[PDB]
Amino acid sequence: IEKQMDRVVKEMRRQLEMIDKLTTREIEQVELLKRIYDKLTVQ
Amino acid sequence: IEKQMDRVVKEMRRQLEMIDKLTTREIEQVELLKRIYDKLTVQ
Amino acid sequence: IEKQMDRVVKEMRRQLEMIDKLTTREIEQVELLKRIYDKLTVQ
Amino acid sequence: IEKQMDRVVKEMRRQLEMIDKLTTREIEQVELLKRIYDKLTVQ
Numbered sequence A, B, C, D: 001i002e003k004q005m006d007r008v009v010k011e012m013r014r015q016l017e018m019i020d021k022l023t024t025r026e027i028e029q030v031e032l033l034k035r036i037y038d039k040l041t042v043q
């Protein structure tokens, strides 16, 4: 159970890394959406 | 195992916070998209 | 440890529900993005 | 606790699959956004 639970902890931290990466990319989308909207308002 | 239980709980609280922030950013994104869509119809 | 691990399982299933909900909303964004792109190609 | 360990592992595998799918949909989304952005510049 000790080793099995140690694997669980490692796998959780791995999935947190995936979520952090996803978060950064989703923020990049907000920057693009804002830029697109501004271009339409300008036109 | 009580120590590793504490590690698991800690990681899960971190995950919850990150998922919660993904959800609030999703809201921001879709409402931008809907504005953009409105303007392409209006134009 | 039994009750503590039972709480962990419940909290995991709860976070899976959040992720499922987020997934559905993210798909809705793809539909909007596709529609926006088509409107530009049309114009 | 061995039974509850199996429940935890099962939920974590499900989560991984769902996060993985969120990441591939993110790719689809941003490349649509970039196309849209290109066209507003080109137009």
Ligand SMILES: [Ca+2]
Binding pocket: A026, A029, B029, C026, C029, D029
């Ligand atoms: Ca998105």
